[PDB]
């Protein structure tokens, strides 16, 4: 009551903090841009896989860990670097959030659905992607790269709203487990066992158009083939941007790198390209080079001033596959709701629109990228009213100089378990991941109920979440955090979550 | 059943062990006293906040920890010292039990209900305090000091039965978080955050009479003000006792010290008064002096022979706020069902009724003080029959020389979680608190399910609960411990617990 | 499904993997044996209590831990040694599975029912023991030694199907706790407590015949008496084998040693007989000698060629009672679903039927001994169709040279909690036991929920379960492990488990 | 300079804090006593083995752990209770300190020297016991009970200065390891191994007069014999006190209980005499009764007012032998320099000399008992000048009302390793004992070097030494703590320590 600064706009939309003065600056910047450009703006989402908060140089990594990222760094120094961007703790949960504007517990997309899985419902028949909505108002929409949000009938991007799909229906490790003989020898060198397991082996990169069928476009059956995966994806993103711009149409492209998911096999060009001379760091060099190649293309096509570029990650680093892992200064990693698992890099670049040199610690969510995309295209009013949407339009936050965020709380779920939330700079845990083996967040952990008080970390003072102080310094704020929790869960009674059985 | 010595008297009352010979002695002592005194006895309950089992010198602390307690020692040495007195693990839960005869899971009083809380019904309408029942038979009843059992409309002591209330609706820490700027700087020196949080800042000590309005009798706006808090409470209890004795009516007074809850600020007189010269120890010297002043007042009024004095705590030491913490020799502390959290000091003094120099290890509960009080006033038959009462009348235990307890089992709850029980000298845990940071029982703990066998500690042999032996030496008793658990839970099916929503 | 090699025979029977060629060998071997022998075969089950996987010399113990086991080694080296035999984590549960062919969560026999518990219905009215079915087709069936699956009315072996019973209704520790004064002094030297606890003291060894009353055959009132317990049981098993062979009837005998359950008191002639010179190691030598005596009796009576001998254990070592404990190389022990508690020794010997010198790592369960017995006697078709049976006939697996197992999965329950399963050589934990005090698997453990991924151990590579790799090397098999788990739980939706209340 | 309040009197003597006014009171009390009594005072040292700080009732034990100690409580309540009394971590070391006035690293008496251990020189030829010095000025000196400071030639009390010795040359567990067959079966039931070990079996209690031979006065060949051990010792102290009073000579008697060292076998009449009904608690009752018997003897002979009674322990509880162990609230136990091992109970009773009801937290040491004894007998001026003496005369501390101690610092050694010191209420660790298994302070511990700062505990605020704060609050005092350490080590270069080889 005395703390809640959010206002309910539509009952099925996450309440947002009004920023009227920032909204006026945003509306004005977009009006003048479209006058000069003659059409709606493009959006380029560069989505790296399992990238940690600290991997880019501007976040305290780069040359400090043997993989300088000059292009990503330049994108940040000449734009807006978000230090409190949040994702979900796992691949599918985050990519679902980014393409539905909904916490995955609502949609049922907490785990990838396989081609032979028994489901009572295809969740995508009910969910609405930004490709669907933006397509209807003139955008050419595409997801190029990793999907991992369902590969059964009617679940690929070009089947759920996007005009064009090209990439991996599952994930890198699904391919490499049938390629690195020694690493997976218990299955690879066991003939009887390999005969069974290889029947569910992925074929390669899939290509698909809205209204058409799926096609194998780049088969993968060796390490040499898979080492070119991100080069091939880069080739398709270039062709997609060339085609959309040459046709004078606004485009919306999610470029979903395969890297740096394990097992990383960078292109031969990049073997030893990083000072560290390790596959995952070489892969980071390849990601930084492809990022620069796409920025250069837009600059050469004269569309850089009309393109919002978002560089982010889908979750924290996968320490379980060390040394094939990224780096994050925070506690934990992929598979936990510690900050290591969910606090991720987030860079917003828009030449002429977003002032250079900004570092902003305002709260932001992957679902906010979804909802900002919808507002940029002018289609927020097209969302269904019987579904609850967790995303918040952050246009006023991104386009204002040192603007304040419109999001008040970040809610954190481990699939169907609600575990923690962040309000202001305070991190409140109601369920805690406890790891038995160092680095083994996913594979050797417990999810434990807290005791008398939820764990509380002031992230400004204890960002690495080393020791909880609970109620000691937070008696004034604890009941409000509980109110945020209960209200959040209440929205899931008012709007039932999907059970896909 | 070869073990159960308890007998069902009224179906809605915790079964008690008959002590018929001790009861004859108690009936005779009470009869002769009322014939000589001319009216029912007074009861004075001295309730110290967050005092550990070993804080008083007579329990093994005092001078050993740099804070002598001579007056409290004299109460024990000239009366009865209980070494197996039990409370609830936290403030609100223990204070509800003391004023309702009921484990707080039955009443819903596991958390303090603040103003503006959503509740189906005010739990206190249904509950029956000893103030209500004793006031009905001519007692002047008062609670002076800390309440912390609800501050919304109709929840202060003068609105739930007591004739007079004077003290803190909430708790010391609620006041001090708005006074110690540096300790709470993230809120106090943040202008916008302070403006919001300070709107729920308590104004001071609240004064209230049955049938009247709440008044702010003593404002608290500085450390200087709050440093006198326990001197002001002492003054009010002196006025109350004087007024009741001058009217010739029996008094029932719960003097609920604010000390030694954090943040401790003793009166200026007591700065450096303890050899330790630390706030929490200086506060212990202040509590001991006030105890002696109240005893000396009763002596000067000629009411010591007709006054039962009970000195006790509401829970174990708050180790989380170290070094502003009491001391206990047992494991854990406040916020856990380790012995450190629930095994608390307990002294019964009654000049001419309770023989001096008794140390008794018989089981006793805070709810037993409630039920003992009701019997001394002759009002047990007034308890509603639709509610289960956990308290047991212990008058035959307190008034018998080296008497045996009427309580067979102590049941331990963490709010809505049943975690452990004690039977004879055996502590059986069905859920265990596990602490991740030293001293951080409340703020950095888990509540974990046990494995194949409940944990068992022979408290005579392992009082510090260092390592469980489970079934190894307790096969004969383990099935009975489970029978006690099952029956205890079954009473909550036959007598439903309150859901306040 | 590409992984599932099992086939549904009957809908209420655990699916098995067909082994047609092994089955032909089994059918032919049995037909020729019965031609020369003139009657169905005998089955002698030697069941040692709390014996670890590695206690026998052939399993890496014996002389290595100061207790040679030559006779048991002879059964293994002249027969078939199973290195992946599994039990339940505790006594009652395992013996229920051995005598009902059903995981104890289905029957309700997760705990011993005491003569004085009052249960909705006696589970043995519904459960079908191999004694009932085999006696119906001409077998003389007996259980001699430890029972521990209920001692209330109609729960002893001679009341639930077996023709003859002689042994302990409960367990060794139930007797020795009233005999070893010092070890149990808190109860033994406390007059009041002993008077109550000893009312439930077992009188001695109970004898019973189908259709007859219970009798106290061997009173136990001293260490002297109970030190001969396994010598008495040996004498009874000798009488029973002699009389079945003299009468020309096939016999089914479960010899259930009291050893090596605590507190071990071997016969005087074995004091110091082991090099280690400790009670539990002396008890091991006594067990080995008794094994050799029964085998010699078969050879003397000319029945060794027509007798399948199964040497196995009921659960892993009880480390909590150290140093009165067996040995196992695996993690944990009795009371946990770690391999230490469930992976147990398993030796099958059948002179002339099972080729000597075999070591086989195929999966096998105690319920498979039940189901294999029923097929050897030819009565599998007599099982009720409204009850699910987890046992699998392993006759083709035991009578084939280096044959493959018919069991695809072992399912592991901690009473009512499903915790893990084994498929192929992979151990997958869904709930993990965590021990807070070394050796204290039963008495100081937690049962914790896993985090993002189930814990996975390749037992060939990590047989001691030292650090889980989870999904890292098992992405191809993890969905199939989930399919097994969910299908297993589904069988208990279709066939309800017994709620004994 | 700024902090040191001690003064150097003789260069080979530990400096002491002058207490001139307390010394004036002490000289007057002793003068008036000797006028009325007619001779020098008696001293009775009651020394319990492995007794914890909290075991007596007045220290927070007794009835709270099921073993009341009324006679020991009465000594404290009617005398002076010391809450900061310190010993050494082990038996031999502490008993050396008590009978030499010197930290045992100086004398070489850190381990008991066994018959024929081949030493460079018997260390007792250099040390000067109070028996020797007091005997020269007319005292009858005796040690009755446990010795444990050397069994070789010339090492028993009657050979190193005491007039009379009667008791155990070694320790209780030296006898019982040859009496409890099952507990020590690896040796007892191994014929060849028992034959070897039993050649060093102690034959029983040894008796000796100054200038006479050793004699076997009570043979111990069974549990029956040893169960009376402390009754036999009580008889001898009675005979000794009677003989001294009838001869009119002042007596100095160290009554060294065998209890409560493992394995505890109390007299038959005490079996179950404690409420806990456990051997170690029954033994506590026997010790309390014998204490009361000796006090009543002195009163009956008319010497109570001329007898200083010291009740204390030689070290903390032996948790390794749990449940045959005492109790202490502090961390650790016997075998460590945690407070649990060295902070011991200490009571001083002197009817008419020491005012009743005192509790004093001043620093006190076992070596101070030695030096105080020498003062009372008037023989301090007879100490050699080539040995450094650590003991300090505390007569002014024990005979003053709430007097301050003459000891500034307590230095703590683990045999030859300097580990910690206490100054004021601050405990400073330079080496730390880390315990790998709960309770196993002696048997499963490491001795670790600290890191950048010595560990510091304010014992008033953290008496259980839960978490060190080091320099954080002690920068003003840490350089002084280091000065104390270095000066202490310097005394050992000026006065070299003994190398026994
Ligand atoms: Ca990912
Ligand atoms: Ca409290
Ligand atoms: Ca067993
Ligand atoms: Ca000792
Ligand atoms: Cl604004
Ligand atoms: Cl290349
Ligand atoms: Cl009675
Ligand atoms: Cl003041
Ligand atoms: Cl086959
Ligand atoms: Cl024998
Ligand atoms: Cl002085
Ligand atoms: Cl006796």
Author numbering:
A (entry chain C), B (entry chain A), C (entry chain B), D (entry chain D): 21 to 521
What does the primary publication say about this deposited structure?
The structural data imply that this hexamer formation results from an uncommon interaction of each PsFucS1 monomer that is oriented perpendicular to the common dimer interface (~ 1500 Å2) that can be found in analogous sulfatases. The uncommon interaction involves interfacing (1246 Å2) through a bundle of α-helices in the N-terminal domain to form a trimeric ring structure. A single peak with an estimated apparent molecular mass of approximately 291 kDa was observed, corroborating a hexameric structure of PsFucS1 in solution, the theoretical molecular mass of which is calculated to be 345.8 kDa (and 172.4 kDa for a trimer). Mapping electrostatic potential onto the surface of PsFucS1 highlights a positively charged pocket, perfectly suited for the recognition of a sulfate group.
PsFucS1 was identified in the genome of a Pseudoalteromonas sp. isolated from sea cucumber gut. PsFucS1 (57 kDa) is Ca2+ dependent and has an unusually high optimal temperature (68 °C) and thermostability.
